[PDB]
Amino acid sequence: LDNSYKMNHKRRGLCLIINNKNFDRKTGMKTRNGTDKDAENLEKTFKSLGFEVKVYNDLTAEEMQETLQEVSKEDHSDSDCFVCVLLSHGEEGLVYGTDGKIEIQELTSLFKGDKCQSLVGKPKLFFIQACRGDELDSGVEV
Amino acid sequence: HKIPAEADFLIAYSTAPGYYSYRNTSNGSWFIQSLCEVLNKYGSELEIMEILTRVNHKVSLRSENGKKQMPCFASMLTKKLYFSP
């Protein structure tokens, strides 16, 4: 069909959750208590949508890059899509490994059509829970 | 006869460019818990854009420092996305 992704493949696909809670002291980043609740809810929610859910806890930046790169070289022919959730500290365009920052684009770019042929034409979804700066939204009365 | 290398990505951010994103140490982040609530009730029925807009709405009606949060999603999808049961 021209207007809707084919979502009736033999598998829904992978949901990959990187849940970073504890950080190296050299980063100065606080422990992210509450994130285990996020990861637990996500695994339940996405399992109910048909995904094969994989939870990774406390990955360094190198481990995050290598984890996603391996997944990008798997055979996704029978998968509807790919989903990745990043739970971490961050700034604009960046998220924290346990040992330091990594560009989000370095992780998403592993899945571009020119590098991951069996996901060409299929949705690649990234959900990112991290700050994108330090501005505060005070709101407006309605 | 090619398609863009950047085609068919969707990035759903917890917050607007430049802003903080809040995490409740008992219940989890505002964005993920709203995402799961909406996906649990509507995920087998609504298109992904409707889902993410409801998440936007759900997070926009919350508080606390008494601050607010507005999620933002960026779409390079080329078709409608349904998580068909």
Binding site: R32, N33, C131 | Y20, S21, Y22, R23, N24, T25
Partner: peptide, 4 residues
């Protein structure tokens, strides 16, 4: 509530 904490920030990320």
């Amino acid at each position: 509530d904490e920030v990320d």
